[PDB]
């Protein structure tokens, strides 16, 4: 049944699966929720963070999405990116 008491955190329920199912005012991991976005310093097309800036590897390590026991841990084997491009001539020639 539902989670009702403080005693249920140690006996019956484990952890919310999404941010909508989380405790009011906190994340799905139990921490306080921060507004996720700050003030961009140094607006500039060539310098400064932009749409073509690369993704720091320490953003997935900070939120813990690099451990296989994490909710947001991505497995890259069964995705559409792992599929062979059928518009390549060496793929349609080998498969034909």
């Amino acid at each position: 049944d539902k989670a009702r008491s403080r005693s249920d955190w140690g006996n019956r329920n484990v952890l919310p699966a999404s941010e909508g199912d989380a405790v009011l005012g906190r994340t799905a991991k139990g921490a306080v929720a921060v507004p996720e976005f700050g003030i961009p310093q140094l607006d500039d097309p060539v310098l400064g963070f932009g749409p073509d800036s690369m993704v720091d590897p320490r953003i997935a390590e900070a939120d813990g999405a690099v451990w296989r026991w994490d909710a947001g841990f991505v497995d890259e084997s069964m995705t559409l990116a792992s599929c062979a491009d059928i518009s390549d001539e060496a793929v349609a020639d080998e498969a034909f």
Partner: protein, 172 residues
């Protein structure tokens, strides 16, 4: 390692941003919980040998094969190393509770533990039952009101029990 205030700094630097007033105001909501977070790790540290041995006693009453001759906790050395494992996991969940997030637990304790137990022949699904029995011994202790002023610390109880859940799905 990261604490909960250094996680938001690392998310903001990987984008070259300042911190807005909405983000600062959410970090001073984390400071105001500061004395209730310190009471929770004090109740876990002060009762730390009754968390471990009451929940190991419970583990062999309902799985008595682990201490029968031929089991994994059968000898005095493998019994002592079994209680060492539970004090180790309880140590790092206690570290992740003052830090505010589980990164010191993730790479110093849980990183490579599931693969360690497979090379030893230790039942990793029974280590998860050991962590789950320390989970509610520690939660029933943190809901206990003795020695504390009056007020609300129920979002912190739900947070402490989530580090015990992360430690228990990482070992099965």
């Amino acid at each position: 390692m990261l604490d909960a205030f250094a996680k938001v700094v690392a998310q903001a630097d990987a984008r070259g941003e300042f911190l807005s007033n909405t983000q600062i105001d959410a970090l001073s909501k984390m400071v105001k919980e500061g004395n209730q977070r310190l009471d929770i790790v004090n109740k876990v540290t002060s009762n730390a040998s009754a968390i471990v041995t009451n929940s190991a006693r419970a583990l062999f009453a309902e799985q008595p094969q682990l201490i029968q001759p031929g089991g994994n906790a059968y000898t005095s050395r493998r019994m002592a190393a079994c209680l060492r494992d539970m004090e180790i996991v309880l140590r790092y969940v206690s570290y992740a509770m003052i830090a505010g997030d589980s990164s010191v637990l993730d790479d110093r304790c849980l990183n490579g533990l599931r693969e360690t137990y497979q090379a030893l022949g230790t039942p990793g699904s029974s280590v998860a039952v050991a962590i789950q029995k320390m989970k509610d011994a520690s939660v029933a202790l943190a809901n206990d009101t003795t020695g504390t002023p009056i007020g609300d610390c129920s979002s912190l109880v739900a947070e402490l029990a989530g580090y015990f859940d992360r430690a228990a799905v990482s070992v099965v």
